[PDB]
Amino acid sequence: PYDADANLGYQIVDPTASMGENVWNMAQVYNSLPPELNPLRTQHLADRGGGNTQAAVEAARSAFDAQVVMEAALLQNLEAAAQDLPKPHRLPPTAGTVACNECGGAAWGYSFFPNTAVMFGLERPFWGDTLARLSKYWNPTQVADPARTGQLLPYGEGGLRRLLALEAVVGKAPATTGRYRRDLELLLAHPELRDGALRVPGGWGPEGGLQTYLRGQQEEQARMQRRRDLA
Amino acid sequence: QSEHNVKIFHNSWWTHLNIKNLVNNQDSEFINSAIIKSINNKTSSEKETMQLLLMSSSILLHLCAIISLVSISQVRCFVKFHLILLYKLSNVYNAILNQLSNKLQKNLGFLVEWSSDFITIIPENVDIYIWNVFSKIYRTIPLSFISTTLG
Amino acid sequence: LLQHKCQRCKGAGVMTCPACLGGGCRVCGTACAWDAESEWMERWGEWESRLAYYDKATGPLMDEWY
């Protein structure tokens, strides 16, 4: 692999020099990328046929660098949250949350006024206080009684229709993992696949993992058995 | 139970970077209000007293911090070094650009200072200039204060 | 000392959409790139392939084999 350049070069880095030297060696000739994205591998052929050989590899290099930068940013946020600091990167909302309306979604800022609570060390709220708050927020009270007020139903809508199997033993069926049912069945039909000599790559679909090995085995046994039929 | 080692190498590799301009796609106003709102709301001419107290406290805090900082000897060494560097670089720039400027009009060491005390190399007209500018800037504070507070 | 935080979100900057805590909600954000659970081992395969190149854990044995 040192000649197919599939792995990093012979002695590009060893951990006993200077990170100063180790970078220079890293940025000599596109050693900061694997081959599949390196443009030196593709700079020689780009033709009328597809026009993707030099474009659809630059469009992959770009996503690569974007993911690397995202990792750097998320780690800076994790470092700012390991202490109690405010996180520096304000990312957009996601599939369960909306942006704060009071602020813009910017969650903090500098103000020229000294933030007395940090200076005097009064930032965090003393566990018992939060306990009391949450305990009085999860336990609302009904001071009116249905005796006088003609409401015998609990709050909500469609109460009249609101009041119209083996969940008490095994219980619920988990619906997030049907996509593996098939595979498990196969793992029961062929016990020999459970030996330590086999090491399947992995995955769920028919194009991944155990089904690949099964298809290979069955097609090859049929192929060469029909090869036996020629003689 | 094993024992762990100190790591001296490419340590964490992610503080080497200022990536804020990339992540926030460029290519603090609700704050200074909640503050003033609170001190107006919670505590016959009392709110003006509280606000003046806040502004004076904040300005004094920043000034006390700066003076306490530069009251350390090594920090004075630091600022002296930066001053001689900026003086020499300004001298280079001045020579070059003034020479090219009167050319366009035609168209149409370090140790002697770094090892000597500060005041013997700097003239007095410089500090007199600084003082005159300061005085001229702030000489209208009493009248502005008086007019502001009194209707 | 000078850092202040929005008091309504407590510095989070982002509040909850209760419509989802219990074709869907259209107020609350765009699903992330990893919400697709049926694309997990594929992305992991690509990433571990790319990571196999940079790796130098078996550097000495590969070196003396070369």
Partner: peptide
């Protein structure tokens, strides 16, 4: 600032 702290401290919900 210690005079103003009980007043400013309501921006966090504390005493």
């Amino acid at each position: 600032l210690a005079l103003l702290t009980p007043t400013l401290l309501t921006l966090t919900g504390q005493s």
